[model samples]
Target: GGPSVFLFPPKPKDTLMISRTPEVTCVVVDVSHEDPEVKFNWYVDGVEVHNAKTKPREEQYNSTYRVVSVLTVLHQDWLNGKEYKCKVSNKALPAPIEKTISKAKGQ
Candidate 1:
């Protein structure tokens, strides 16, 4: 019975190292006992993302539900020091959970 959220930090693809445009991926996971679908909001540099497709799933073992959201971005942005954020919200939690990523740490 937990509306817990886990964020797998953004990963930088190696293609960028070869001077190719790589794709940066960020994963957001949300778990809760409630059956209602969770909301996933993605952002880049404080700007909201509207076109990214979101994928969600529920675990079979527990009554709890899980949702996974993936956001992809151009590698050039990451190389230029752009930041990304994922925010999740559900009735199970009192507030929304947010995770942030940047190139500085992953580099």
Candidate 2:
């Protein structure tokens, strides 16, 4: 498979109201081809992240395979203005397809 990309639009940016203790914000990078065979690395404020998941699940826009990288942060971090972002990479492009949060303005 080629053309590694974010086959599905998961959510570029949005404020997640953390009603519960621990909430999840995910950035899913998908590809039209099967088994993207790619790698993923998430970041925030130009810093890398740790602690995430992948349940071996795949289903988006009828695509064959993709990766779901989740970054779990304290709900307090979110309230503290923590931003989460994602990046997808492969042989398709030198730079990985990156998804970043859009800080809302005067909403």
Candidate 3:
């Protein structure tokens, strides 16, 4: 009998910062697995704007899973301090996981 090994994909860390400059609005996600096929979905003001798979042309690194997604908000719609969110998932996994970034209003 062979020893059983349970493998699990890494979960994304929490949203880092809230308010940022135009160029600083980029979010870099780290997916710590090897050779992982990743998908990125961008949302602005709680609405889905761009969604696509990351290809090799987009990323030059080779790994099972790594920082496979980069979401940038540069359009006029994103300049109004609107809440932006990004969801990254792996195709080889059973269920997709999501990460969200939003503005923090003073209560």
lDDT of each: 0.63, 0.51, 0.40
- Highest lDDT: which candidate? 1
Candidates by lDDT, descending order: 1, 2, 3
lDDT of 2 by residue, 1-107 (tens): 44443322213243244443343444344454644565667675668776655445465676655556555556455555555566666655556676655233101
TM-score of 2: 0.59
CA displacement after TM-score superposition, residue 11 of candidate 2 (Å): 12
Per-model TM-score, in order, reads 0.73, 0.59, 0.45
| lDDT per residue (tens digit) for residues 1-107 in model 1 | 35655555434554256554444444433364554677888788999987656665666465555566666566667677777777777777788878777776631
**Evaluated with TM-score, which candidate comes out highest?**
1
Clash pairs for candidate 3: 33-64, 33-65, 34-63, 34-64, 34-65, 35-63, 35-64, 35-65, 36-64
| Number of clashing pairs per prediction, in order | 0, 1, 9
For candidate 2, what is the total of clashing residue pairs? 1
Of the two candidates 2 and 3, the one with more favorable TM-score, higher being better, is 2
- Which residue ranges in model 2 land beyond 4 Å of their true spot? 1-24, 27-35, 57-63, 102-107
User: Can you give the lDDT of residue 8 in candidate 2?
Assistant: 26
The RMSD of every model to the true structure, in order and in angstroms, is 3.3, 5.3, 9.9
Q: Is candidate 1 or candidate 3 better by TM-score?
A: 1
User: Any residue pairs clashing in model 1, and if so which?
Assistant: none
